[PDB]
């Protein structure tokens, strides 16, 4: 089984630099690409970095270019965050993820398969496609439908498949696949959760809802760089009321 964990948060000033570490094990780490996403302390989860296996293509998100550098050590399965002129947005969780490829008959698709635990970062006192989900928050009866939406700014489709995914949270968990290419069951994943829709418009359904579904749920698009996500919708469960004979 594959594990990621990651190292070297703290509290620091602002202005100052810090280094972050991930070991990675249970698989080939060489073969794969990588990326650092962070979540803030209002939930909201953002790509930070990308790189190759070989460190030959790198991506990093607008809000930190020049000031944070992604690099690896492929002999020693490691991975790391280099961090300068540290300000206050950039307080959060940060987790490592793994580009993992899912073969299939037209093309291999590659997702954020495996995450980390996380490590946690607080400094102290002093045309990206744009992906709109609703609602915020609901509360669903025993057995009955969670039903979530997300419109995409432009659309999301490569000449016949649409690059959404789906992830579901729980708290002290990093984010779980639970669908990809818009409606393709994640392996594992339950058919009580589907998904639907193409070009702008997408959508989530669980039914019949159970007691562990209790979760935030996100949507995210892998068709352009930068990986962008929604703003999250929390799932709270309904008790009904108990029969009679």
């Known amino acids: 089984e594959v594990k990621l964990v990651e190292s070297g948060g703290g509290l620091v000033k602002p202005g100052g630099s810090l280094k972050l570490s991930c070991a990675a094990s249970?698989?080939?780490?060489?073969?794969?690409?990588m990326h650092w996403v962070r979540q803030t302390p209002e939930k909201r989860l953002e790509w930070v970095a990308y790189i190759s296996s070989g460190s030959s293509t790198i991506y990093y998100a607008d809000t930190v270019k020049g000031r944070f550098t992604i690099s690896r050590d492929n002999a020693k399965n490691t991975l790391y965050l280099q961090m300068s002129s540290l300000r206050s947005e950039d307080t959060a969780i940060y987790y490592c993820?793994?580009?993992?490829?899912?073969?299939?008959?037209?093309?291999?698709?590659?997702?954020?398969?495996?995450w980390g635990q996380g490590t946690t970062l607080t400094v102290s006192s002093g045309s990206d496609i744009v992906l709109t989900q609703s609602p915020a928050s609901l509360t669903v009866s025993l057995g009955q439908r969670a039903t979530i939406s997300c419109r995409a700014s432009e659309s999301v489709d490569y000449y016949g498949k649409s690059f959404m995914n789906w992830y579901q949270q729980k708290p002290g968990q990093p984010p779980k696949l639970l669908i990809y290419a818009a409606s393709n069951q994640g392996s594992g994943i339950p058919a009580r959760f589907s998904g639907s829709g193409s070009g702008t418009d997408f959508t989530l359904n669980i039914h019949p809802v159970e007691e562990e579904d209790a979760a935030t749920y996100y949507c995210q698009q892998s068709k352009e760089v930068p990986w962008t996500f929604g703003a999250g919708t929390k799932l709270e469960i309904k008790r009904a009321a108990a029969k009679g004979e």
């Open positions: 249970g698989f080939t780490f060489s073969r794969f690409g």
């Open positions: 993820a793994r580009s993992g490829g899912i073969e299939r008959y037209d093309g291999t698709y590659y997702v954020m398969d495996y």
